[model samples]
Target: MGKLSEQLKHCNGILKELLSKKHAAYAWPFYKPVDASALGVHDYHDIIKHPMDLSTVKRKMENRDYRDAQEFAADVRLMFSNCYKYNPPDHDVVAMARKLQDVFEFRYAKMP
Candidate 1:
């Protein structure tokens, strides 16, 4: 209720920390939207209509799209979920997402 300030502050800390890891090779692919053409068109666009990326989330942050921790975390979760939807479980991309995803949730859960 009155915890909006707390939510935004901690969530911003977590978000900024997560986004700062864009340099990791495993994180590059997620920094921007997936290139359907680069992957050779085969219905990927048709399958993943709701394509989410770090840049998109970043842009949303700039626009003040997030009002609280949960709102901000929802987009990050969506990005990972979309990756899981498009990539196989054993794929390397999925591997990194799993790691970052868990880390995000772990930090989010500890928020006061």
Candidate 2:
């Protein structure tokens, strides 16, 4: 079988984690992240401003038509980069950012 593009691998990996709640830093454009107060949850406060609605993210992920993994990767990079730009870093935040960077750099990253 043909190999999957790096872009799909990165995006699919991200989506897999996001959908599973293993990662907690996704916020859809135009849609506000879930409200922490509304949910009465204090977890992952450092990694995200508003909580994410995984259902929405799942729906959004399903709707994308990506012909170019590189282009899609660029968009993902911008979003995740901006996530940590204004916030103070923490272990979770830094780690999450690094995951995104790792995926973004997957093409040139030395494989294990």
Candidate 3:
């Protein structure tokens, strides 16, 4: 109902496209002209390293005293790692997934 913040749009648009794009370049963090102009192999690689919507996730979590929102955010992040972006040296889907379970308290209830 209001103008969306940049990070919100980034997650809803670019990050939401995880696993659905046919081109590797069109994956999450879908480039603007500037991002495309700055491209390199390692730059493309670093895109995988960055936390997409981490700020947005943190913002949403601020209002969510319960763990559901945090768990959902973690699940979304894992989906990005497993389905959207290529895994690099530090990528770990299982660990990311574990965070989600912990958020759910079957596991890390400490986040909230």
Per-residue CA lDDT of model 1 for 17-56, tens digit only, reads: 6777553556667788888898785777888878888888
The order by descending TM-score is 1, 2, 3
Q: Which stretches of candidate 2 lie over 4 Å from their true place?
A: 1-14, 17-58, 90-92, 107-112
lDDT, each prediction:
0.78, 0.49, 0.39
Q: What value does the lDDT take at residue 100 in candidate 3?
A: 36
- 1 against 2, candidate with superior lDDT: 1
Off by over 4 Å in 1: 1-4
Better TM-score candidate (1, 2)? 1
Expressed as tens digits, the lDDT of each residue in 14-111 for candidate 2 is: 55644443333422221345364675745546555443333544454456545545545455555555556534677465566676456446532432
Predicted model with the maximum TM-score? 1
Lowest lDDT 10-mer window, candidate 3? 25-34
- Candidate number with greatest lDDT: 1
Lowest summed lDDT window (length 10), candidate 1: 1-10
After superposition, the stretches of candidate 3 with alpha carbons farther than 4 Å from their true spots are: 1-51, 63-70, 76-84, 89-112
Instruction: Give TM per candidate.
Output: 0.83, 0.41, 0.26
Per-residue alpha-carbon lDDT of model 3 for 1-112, expressed as tens digits?
A: 4544443443334333332444223333422211323644455435654443333443443444224444554645554453245444354544443443233233122332
